[PDB]
Amino acid sequence: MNLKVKGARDVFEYMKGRIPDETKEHLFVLFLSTKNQILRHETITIGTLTASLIHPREIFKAAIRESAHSIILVHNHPSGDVQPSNADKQVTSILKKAGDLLQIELLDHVIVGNNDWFSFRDHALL
């Protein structure tokens, strides 16, 4: 059971086969227990990532309902460069401080693509 998240790599592996259409951009939120066990995940956006499509209210209602301890954000890039856009970095800002507010910490934001992933935390970017 690879459902315990120790690092970004575990997120990458968990999301394998879970992108509905890899040509489309998708935002996902994984809900983690106090022991970093992936409880479940939800599809936030399906579309192109604008910060206005993010409604902290919805994301965290599911978090609070699942009594998630923390959350991890996953973005796929159809293209294949897992480097983050400024749209990605804006949604990271608003969910980081909404999680701090609500004490449901944004542990990481991981961008996934073909064979490859990018961790915001690992690039001192969270």
Curated annotation (Swiss-Prot):
Positions contributing to Zn(2+) binding: H75, H77, D88
GO molecular function: metal ion binding; metallopeptidase activity
Keyword annotations of the record: Hydrolase, Metal-binding, Metalloprotease, Protease, Zinc
Motif JAMM motif mapped to chain: 75-88
Superkingdom to which the source organism belongs: Bacteria
Any single GO BP term: proteolysis
Residues of the MPN domain: 4-126
Family that this chain belongs to: Belongs to the UPF0758 family.
Name the record gives this protein: UPF0758 protein CT0611
Source organism of this protein record: Chlorobaculum tepidum (strain ATCC 49652 / DSM 12025 / NBRC 103806 / TLS) (Chlorobium tepidum)
Highest classification ranks of the organism: Bacteria, Pseudomonadati, Chlorobiota, Chlorobiia, Chlorobiales
